[PDB]
Design a protein around this ligand. Structure first.
Ligand code: TP2
Ligand code: TP2
Lengths: 264, 264
């Protein structure tokens, strides 16, 4: 997409050479923001085909609050396979913190139920937030949350959401992360009876891996296509009742997918 | 400063007229990002006289982990006085979370000491983060954090910092928050033998209260002056040992102070 393709070119032109924990290099910048008006269309990258299948399964898995990858296994989603332990456990990563953030005194906080009630009873709140950044549980996680904190906002009947992404693999993770959050906004807008507003994406350490450079150069030579349109075929009773088949993307016409080596 | 007046002009030109928790009335935009290269000068607003006295006191108080206004009220700092209980307590707000985030297993994490060690030993880490967003303890706090989460980053010997400010009073709070974090960045860079890089400010619900409108347009009729300069006079043994008198501002020649009323 245009903002996506400008950010890629910005990392190339001004990123500085950095080394990651894996000994692979990166070109990196710090501080970047893009805004997607979801009424202009579903923000799925069109300069390389992006499969939504796993994105959709992951989001539902998150909202259900389980962190073991058996559900992903049941639908053959393998994006989390390498962090899981022998029992398929990730520790208390995203979904555990979204639905059951553990308190000092033994209880759990359901941040999705909270934001849904704030959106419905107090939509002008300035603290309609969900944080995955549970400092006291970072050491138990298979990985520290990348897409770390998000906030919702309502204006003129429209629901917007901003994500702070402390660490961003521009080529491989970003298209995935942008779709995931746009998806959730549509879902929440429907459950709160709102229209969709903007998806504001803000990055911390925003980088392109050194072995993503040919694929980036190839992707910058293509021209973006008009954005697709998301169709939710059925309005379920609550935000926790979506099923994979509820979502359809229409008008998606991407250039060919581009394969990139994944860095562990 | 230029970035600061551009943000005021943006809220006035794009903002949505809404109300506050008290119902006061705001003009707000959702999502914004701006940058201050700290080698250009210490980002203290000059379109109205701002006093660094209180900001320094508040930051040393935060850094001690303190949440009682006693130290602030001794040094005639009254900015927290309306939130404090009859004992002067604010609850586990900012400084408590910075220095002793309570984990579910009964540990306490010192986030500042953690980012200090990560700056010295793993400056390329993509998780050098301090979060005040302790979901579990928000409702024990006199108010939920405004300047909720910040991240450090190092490139070419310079220390940068990005803050995610989930609610921003642009006219009254913002000048104080930008100067607070820029002072923090100078202190950390001093402790890690780094030079200062950029302060990146990102906002969530970013608003002007409607009783600050004439003050805001008064400010907007003035030209930004040249940025003052910060001189630190000593290199204390740790980031926790700075004193008020180690800090000097040079070249500060602001337009006149502009008073305005605060929100409850
Ligand atoms: S575990 C270290 C950082 N990686 C991640 O969190 C990965 C694990 C699977 C999902 N995320 S992702 O960054 O959103 C992602 C998604 C898809 C691909 C191909 C790579 C990364
Ligand atoms: S407790 C409700 C929100 N108010 C604050 O968090 C205040 C208390 C003092 C620090 N903050 S502030 O938003 O940074 C601020 C600073 C200075 C003035 C004059 C007003 C508000």
């Amino acid at each position: 997409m245009k903002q996506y393709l400008e950010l890629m070119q910005k990392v190339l032109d001004e990123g500085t050479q950095k080394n990651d924990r894996t000994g692979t290099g990166t070109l990196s910048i710090f501080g970047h923001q893009m805004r997607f008006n979801l009424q202009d269309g579903f923000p799925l990258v069109t300069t390389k085909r992006c499969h939504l299948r796993s994105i959709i399964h992951e989001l539902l898995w998150f909202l259900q609050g389980d962190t073991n990858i058996a559900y992903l296994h049941e639908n053959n989603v393998t994006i989390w396979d390498e962090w899981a332990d022998e029992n398929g456990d990730l520790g208390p990563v995203y979904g555990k913190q979204w639905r059951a953030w553990p308190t000092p005194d033994g209880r759990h906080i359901d941040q999705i139920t909270t934001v849904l009630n704030q959106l419905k009873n107090d939509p002008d709140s300035r603290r309609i937030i969900v944080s995955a950044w549970n400092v006291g549980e970072l050491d138990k996680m298979a990985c520290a949350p990348s897409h770390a904190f998000f906030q919702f906002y309502v204006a003129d009947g429209k629901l917007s959401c901003q994500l702070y992404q402390r660490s961003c693999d521009v080529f491989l993770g970003l298209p995935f992360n942008i779709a995931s959050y746009a998806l959730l906004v549509h879902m929440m807008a429907q459950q709160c009876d709102l229209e969709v507003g903007d998806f504001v994406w803000t990055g911390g350490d925003t980088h392109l891996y050194s072995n993503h450079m040919d694929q980036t150069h190839l992707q910058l030579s293509r021209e973006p296509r008009p954005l697709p349109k998301l169709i939710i075929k059925r309005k379920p009773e609550s935000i926790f009742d979506y099923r994979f088949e509820d979502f359809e993307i229409e008008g998606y016409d991407p250039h060919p997918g581009i394969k990139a080596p994944v860095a562990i």
